Amino acid sequence: XXXXXXXXXXXXXXXXXXXXXXXXXXQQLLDIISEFILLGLNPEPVCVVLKKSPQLLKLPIMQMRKRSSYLQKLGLGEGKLKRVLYCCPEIFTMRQQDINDTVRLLKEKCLFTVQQVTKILHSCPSVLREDLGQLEYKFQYAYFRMGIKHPDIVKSEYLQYSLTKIKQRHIYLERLGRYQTPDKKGQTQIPNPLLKDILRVSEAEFLARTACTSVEEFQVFKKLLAREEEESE
Amino acid sequence: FPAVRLALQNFDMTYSVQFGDLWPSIRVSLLSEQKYGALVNNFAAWDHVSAKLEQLSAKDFVNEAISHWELQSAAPSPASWACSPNLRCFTFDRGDISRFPPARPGSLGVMEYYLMDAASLLPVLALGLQPGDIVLDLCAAPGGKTLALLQTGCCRNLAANDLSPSRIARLQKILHSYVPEEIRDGNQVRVTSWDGRKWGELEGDTYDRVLVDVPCTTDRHSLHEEENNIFKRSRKKERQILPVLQVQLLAAGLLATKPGGHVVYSTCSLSHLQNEYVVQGAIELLANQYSIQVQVEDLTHFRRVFMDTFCFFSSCQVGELVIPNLMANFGPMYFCKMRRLT
Numbered sequence A: 001x002x003x004x005x006x007x008x009x010x011x012x013x014x015x016x017x018x019x020x021x022x023x024x025x026x027q028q029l030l031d032i033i034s035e036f037i038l039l040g041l042n043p044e045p046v047c048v049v050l051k052k053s054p055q056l057l058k059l060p061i062m063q064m065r066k067r068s069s070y071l072q073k074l075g076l077g078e079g080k081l082k083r084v085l086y087c088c089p090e091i092f093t094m095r096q097q098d099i100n101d102t103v104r105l106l107k108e109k110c111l112f113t114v115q116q117v118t119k120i121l122h123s124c125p126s127v128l129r130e131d132l133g134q135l136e137y138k139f140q141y142a143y144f145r146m147g148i149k150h151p152d153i154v155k156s157e158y159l160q161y162s163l164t165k166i167k168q169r170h171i172y173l174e175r176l177g178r179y180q181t182p183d184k185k186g187q188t189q190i191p192n193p194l195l196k197d198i199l200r201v202s203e204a205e206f207l208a209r210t211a212c213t214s215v216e217e218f219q220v221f222k223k224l225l226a227r228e229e230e231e232s233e
Numbered sequence B: 001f002p003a004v005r006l007a008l009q010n011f012d013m014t015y016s017v018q019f020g021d022l023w024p025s026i027r028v029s030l031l032s033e034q035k036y037g038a039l040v041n042n043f044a045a046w047d048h049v050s051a052k053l054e055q056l057s058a059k060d061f062v063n064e065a066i067s068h069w070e071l072q073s074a075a076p077s078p079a080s081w082a083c084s085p086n087l088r089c090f091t092f093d094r095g096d097i098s099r100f101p102p103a104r105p106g107s108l109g110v111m112e113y114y115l116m117d118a119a120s121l122l123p124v125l126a127l128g129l130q131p132g133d134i135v136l137d138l139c140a141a142p143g144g145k146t147l148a149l150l151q152t153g154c155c156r157n158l159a160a161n162d163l164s165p166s167r168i169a170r171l172q173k174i175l176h177s178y179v180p181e182e183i184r185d186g187n188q189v190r191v192t193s194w195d196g197r198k199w200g201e202l203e204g205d206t207y208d209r210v211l212v213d214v215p216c217t218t219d220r221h222s223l224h225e226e227e228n229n230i231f232k233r234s235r236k237k238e239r240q241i242l243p244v245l246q247v248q249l250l251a252a253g254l255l256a257t258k259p260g261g262h263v264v265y266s267t268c269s270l271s272h273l274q275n276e277y278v279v280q281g282a283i284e285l286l287a288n289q290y291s292i293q294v295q296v297e298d299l300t301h302f303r304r305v306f307m308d309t310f311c312f313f314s315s316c317q318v319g320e321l322v323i324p325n326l327m328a329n330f331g332p333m334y335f336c337k338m339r340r341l342t
């Protein structure tokens, strides 16, 4: 009954025939976009992430709705939760224990906050695919060796980056003399670069504007640093 | 509070002034693994050993530089007039961070090669040894440059001196491992532990070639080794008086040189207070106290030919300076060639 569907679908957001014809192309094809509707936002992103990993259609609604109430309790509701399902569709199909273990690690191993944890979860979905303890060490590297406190660790989306990227760029800056560990109360003699100008930007931009060295020098450094790491560990 | 940390703090203040935008690239290199060259033992099976080093993908940077001597479009003289001969030293390509295996004894029972900062070979090369030369290494231990001087096969006699009896014991170990009991136990080599400052009274006007590779703040080592660090609070007086000691040593080296002979002063510091300033201090001391004229020799062409292998700080008033760079993590190595005219 395409009326019993397209009534609810066209009254809600389906821009063109489009992704509905793609839905036909790909009773579970309606009870799910509702769970997403309640998750919220995503009028066009719902089509975008329906195209990316169509598996959500295969997902049982009992399991999915449980997963939706779960994420909402974590603070992913009101939804968006936008970039999350875009780059980490696995969140709705992966083992629940994964998510809870990450939460139980951020909270109370690394401390932070229910709000801080919800923020990281939304911004750094990578953290769910990453080895626990490797995650802990990465937090520890931020806090103890870089001297970044919790609010900046979340504000800058630090936990999203590989620990290799962090160590490579940070240690390079440190040996260049261009990054100084905050002393006590967090004072450096020279301000330090913005965390985004260290980790967010492309390698070429980082080397051009922050590290201020050639690219070949950094490539050699990466090799030197990797050997140092292998040889102490 | 660690002496290693006082060293870095001291270098940061002085070398960011000396080098400006160039300092970070040097700094990161000082704090990362040094690159090594393998000086082939000419007393071992040098051709065979050279072939094994080549097979590793390393290349003799001396031969490579020398083969380009009359390129650059000019040279003051043929390479053989200007550089000490027969030295083969293999390094991996720029940016290649490979290590050589540790050397082992070969068929003749001597070590096949000697691993060293490739930059250390440059003052020996620049000294310009020629057959029949009477040579003095005034501050010789543990003996890397001493060994290279001997390898040239140009030392009719080599005086190897070092004030420290214990460091001289290391030099003796090296001579025993590298040099057959024939050259080392002959009339050719004399090893002493005398104060180098006294050389003008001991053997004035005697040597054709003198190497003065002085005690200094040894920048790289001082950033890595906490023990007996020159930057310890306990050695501050000693540290600050270094350029006075360095001038006295270079002056002595010059006094020991025949009129017409040549001297290379070297340090492993980036500091102009230990480098150009010492050269200038010794020359002034010799003019004013002894009426002896000393001429700094121009190593520009020499530097240019070796720029394929080393990074240099090109604005050195007198002398030349290899600076650490990640593509070629050699040095620091300051060196200045000069001739005693009178």
Ligand SMILES: C[S@@+](CC[C@H](N)C(=O)[O-])C[C@H]1O[C@@H](n2cnc3c(N)ncnc32)[C@H](O)[C@@H]1O
Residues within 6 Å of the ligand: B120, B138, B139, B140, B141, B142, B143, B144, B145, B146, B161, B162, B163, B164, B167, B194, B195, B196, B197, B213, B214, B215, B216
């Ligand atoms: C940089 S090291 C020499 C390195 C050596 N030419 C080599 O290539 O292996 C400087 C040396 O000067 C020695 N020294 C310090 N004061 C001295 C003095 N007054 N006379 C002679 N040697 C001295 C130290 O014992 C030290 O071994």
